[PDB]
Amino acid sequence: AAASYDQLLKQVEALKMENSNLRQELEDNSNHLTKLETEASNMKEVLKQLQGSI
């Protein structure tokens, strides 16, 4: 049979926390992608000015 009103309330509480955690993760990982690209690019950039050379 269907969950009681209280059982649903518990599902919602756990679902909301999970949703908050998933957002935190995506946010973390999204920032991590950005920092990885920045690092790759700084490398590309310092590589150019070095190949320049003398």
Side-chain angles (χ1 to χ4, degrees), residues 1-53:
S4 65
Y5 182 93
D6 296 299
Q7 299 166 319
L8 280 190
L9 179 58
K10 284 184 176 181
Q11 285 185 40
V12 171
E13 289 168 25
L15 283 169
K16 287 183 185 172
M17 178 279 300
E18 178 175 31
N19 179 279
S20 303
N21 273 13
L22 289 169
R23 287 166 176 258
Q24 288 295 310
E25 293 174 34
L26 180 65
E27 195 181 312
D28 193 342
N29 290 350
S30 295
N31 175 59
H32 184 41
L33 178 93
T34 290
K35 294 296 171 188
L36 288 178
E37 298 165 314
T38 295
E39 289 151 23
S41 305
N42 293 334
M43 173 70 36
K44 177 168 180 173
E45 211 223 301
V46 70
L47 288 175
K48 285 186 71 176
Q49 67 178 308
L50 283 167
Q51 320 299 298
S53 187

